[PDB]
Amino acid sequence: GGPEQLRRNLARVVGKPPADVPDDLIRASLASYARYWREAFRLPAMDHGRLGEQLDVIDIDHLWSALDAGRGAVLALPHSGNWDMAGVWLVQNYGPFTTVAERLKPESLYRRFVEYRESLGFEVLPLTGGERPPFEVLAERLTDNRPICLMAERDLTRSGVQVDFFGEATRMPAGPAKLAIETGAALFPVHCWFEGDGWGMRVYPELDTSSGDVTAITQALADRFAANIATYPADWHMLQPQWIADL
Numbered sequence: 001g002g003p004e005q006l007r008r009n010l011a012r013v014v015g016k017p018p019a020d021v022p023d024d025l026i027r028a029s030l031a032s033y034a035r036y037w038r039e040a041f042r043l044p045a046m047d048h049g050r051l052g053e054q055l056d057v058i059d060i061d062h063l064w065s066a067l068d069a070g071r072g073a074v075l076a077l078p079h080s081g082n083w084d085m086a087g088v089w090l091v092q093n094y095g096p097f098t099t100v101a102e103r104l105k106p107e108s109l110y111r112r113f114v115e116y117r118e119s120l121g122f123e124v125l126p127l128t129g130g131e132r133p134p135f136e137v138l139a140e141r142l143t144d145n146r147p148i149c150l151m152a153e154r155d156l157t158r159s160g161v162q163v164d165f166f167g168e169a170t171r172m173p174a175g176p177a178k179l180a181i182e183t184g185a186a187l188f189p190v191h192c193w194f195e196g197d198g199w200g201m202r203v204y205p206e207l208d209t210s211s212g213d214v215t216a217i218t219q220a221l222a223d224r225f226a227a228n229i230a231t232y233p234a235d236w237h238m239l240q241p242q243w244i245a246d247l
């Protein structure tokens with residue numbers, strides 16, 4: 001989609017026609033987008049121990065307490081800030097975790113990305129073409145009282161859950177809700193953003209699963225993502241189509 005699709009996505013976040021999205025916001029979002037890729041370049045070579053010691057996560061005790069209760073946890077977050085840096089922080093402060101990635105094309109580029117995240121200490125499952133269904137591995141991780149992390153605000157396929165997002169229809173993956181219902185794992189929304197020259201991260205209160213309804217739960221997740229993106233609009237680098245009307 002590139003910058004023009006980014007402008008159109010920011011138009012929803014901010015409630016204005018694409019043409020009226022503030023110039024300063026478009027600028028900051030492109031700078032934020034550039035920063036992610038500049039950090040991805042060097043992140044495998046940074047001092048991960050130092051980063052784990054010196055960065056903080058607001059309300060990380062949410063997660064720790066879910067793991068003290070033996071429940072496992074689903075950390076669901078949007079494409080904001082540098083989520084790979086948060087992953088480094090979790091690897092250093094808790095240990096390796098499991099996640100999931102679209103099997104991009106070409107396979108050589110997919111492998112580049114796998115190597116990148118594996119060098120950060122993550123276990124990355126292919127969304128397609130792996131030995132086992134990713135869901136089933138994830139559920140086994142949760143039942144072993146482990147955290148999993150899922151990028152959770154975009155899934156524009158037939159099986160994605162339709163939710164309202166900044167007042168308009170989009171689709172988000174059902175996995176986070178499905179996994180929490182099936183395993184009892186706590187479903188924590190997470191947000192990452194850029195905090196000056198550093199990184200801001202927060203774990204939010206777990207989502208109520210009493211409804212047993214994937215669509216209601218995913219809507220609550222979307223609502224929290226929308227509130228967090230609204231706080232740091234420039235850090236949500238969604239340059240791909242997000243809302244259904246843009247497909």
Ligand SMILES: CCCCCCCCCCCCCCCC(=O)O
Binds near residue numbers: 083084090101117151
């Ligand atoms: C604040 C608590 C720790 C949060 C850690 C979250 C780590 C997220 C890691 C995601 C890795 C996969 C991202 C690539 C997927 C894609 O966009 O195709």
Ligand SMILES: [Mg+2]
Binds near residue numbers: 209
């Ligand atoms: Mg309840």
